[PDB]
């Protein structure tokens, strides 16, 4: 959103949390969390999650829109308060193909997103395809981005075009804090590639550049933002119309989010942390169900989750450790959150629902909430929350959204 | 303390947290929590815990003093910053016995506390003994308090006497205390104390126990309703005393603050401290199940459950009858009857086996977020480590933090 960024550029401490999750409960929580505020909610898909072929979620951009809208309707959240975004749009998942074929799919990808009413468009053709040199000449990155912007602008209706915002650049190094001269060079070459295609107006719609401010996580480690080390970057962006977008901002302290927004990292992408919180809720509720529910009725859902992930290891296998118990500890507790790819699995969905139905039929003792969901227990104590399983899950996800809101709001 | 209450009577928002626990770890947490402040720490025992005959702890009041002091020495807590008190001192343990046998036990109980340097003394002889009318006449309750106070006075040094504070009354009903019944309790105690020659000792009565509308049981908390305790709050302003409130466990930090404001200046906590300790133990046992090799696991939880099922005297009258229900009560009830089992030999050793296993291992961040999320947030902000002992300490500090919010 242009107005929010303009308020930031005029010196207001304000940022936006970009929700990068396809999980329906996470999207429900994101929308519910702001139901009674006036803030816009930003939800973004990656070209892998959703594209013209359905990505891996079986959703086209049009599908994803209606999916989010249907959740919004159920919540009571006005569809117009929703910003939809495309993350890392470009040849990303057609990387193994030659330039022509990957760039043909990328053009139709950008067009699919734009036609579906996605207004925030991240253009990223920094990856080398088959036959390409490694790495790309920075001029080649820019040119390919201009081709993608040209495609967006050409399918846009007049109304959509004026509302389109472009993000450029990538967090991927060609943790290493981005050099100001590389960010400068990324802008300069995008400028030049845009002008070479007559994209003079579209260039004023490039609102953000992606940099690495010094944040990351892997399995059991967080790289905490160090403001002193990002001051050069922070200062460079001030003499532009743009803000920074930061990726992989998950698991930072609420102080860091505030510092980040102060230092002009005003669009903060979150994802794993949201489903990580959801998963902690499900695990907590499953432990509760194991003791509270009669043995013939228990869902067995933790055993189901584990079995599925062990037999279809493809989404986790390249991330986790080899030792057997180490792999289970990772499957369960890694900040990386590779479990997020398995919630759609039919066995997992069925057993989690069985669990939910079971727990909705009985009052959960307060002491079990204190044990397994302590922060929810305290909110129940203060009369702000009920012991309803669905609300306990929401609240778990809200706590992630609360950390961001502290950073992004006044 | 008399100066704390004097500040309160002069209009300052100040309270004190009365820690009613015998657990060494909770006592250690209490002392370490105020290690760097200038606050006094109040630790109280009941007759059941500690008396002439050792109670159930196997500690006389003298033993309990050295036990607190030994913990204070390790923390680096100056012994002089500690206040030792006796809770519900009177014939509660020996109700089954005759009036005069239960009362002789009670005077020797109260003498032993005073001799051992306990400076805060709750006199409560409101229970009916064998041969008594149910309930006792308020005059009778008053009379027996005067007897116990006389016994406390009869043994103090000049120094100890100058320092001796009394509390009177009880929370146990004969629903929020009628101002009238509170006034009647005070009035009768004054008359009985005076009649016993105890006019000077009367000036040393610092508090009366009432019910301000705070309670818990297994899975329910009755939350303090400030507007319902306003009549009580305005009555005590006229008197030389403050209120002491019992069973304040599990309230909000804002209810604690409201309590002190409304002159419930002594707040008694106990089961919430050990409840928190038990949550840390249970979380660590789960972490141990997943991190430690099969041949080295403590079997902590299975030992606890077995021991509690086999020696069930401390919980049997509290918990439910159904077998699974009784397991859920044993684990999770806010009554925390498990607190009586920590000193058992099998439980102690399996808990220490667990701690030894866990101290050699690196606990993944993700597990602490799952099982100890508030501790994880502290680690996340770099104000705590993934050290098992420090994880138990922090669970107990959170209870203590809520009180400090209300009291300081």
Curated annotation (Swiss-Prot), chain B:
One of its GO terms (biological process) is phosphoenolpyruvate-dependent sugar phosphotransferase system. Pathway: Carbohydrate metabolism; D-tagatose 6-phosphate degradation; D-glyceraldehyde 3-phosphate and glycerone phosphate from D-tagatose 6-phosphate: step 2/2. SUPFAM superfamilies: Aldolase (SSF51569). Induction: Constitutively expressed. It comes from the Bacteria. Gene3D superfamilies: Aldolase class I, putative tagatose 6-phosphate kinase domain like. InterPro entries: Aldolase_TIM, GatZ/KbaZ-like, GatZ_KbaZ_carbometab, TagBP_ald_GatZ. GO terms for cellular component: catalytic complex; plasma membrane. Keywords: Galactitol metabolism. GO terms for molecular function: enzyme activator activity. Pfam families: GatZ_KbaZ-like (PF08013). Component of the tagatose-1,6-bisphosphate aldolase GatYZ that is required for full activity and stability of the Y subunit. Could have a chaperone-like function for the proper and stable folding of GatY. When expressed alone, GatZ does not show any aldolase activity. Is involved in the catabolism of galactitol. Belongs to the GatZ/KbaZ family. GatZ subfamily. PANTHER family: D-TAGATOSE-1,6-BISPHOSPHATE ALDOLASE SUBUNIT GATZ, N-ACETYLGALACTOSAMINE PERMEASE II COMPONENT-RELATED. Forms a complex with GatY. This is D-tagatose-1,6-bisphosphate aldolase subunit GatZ.
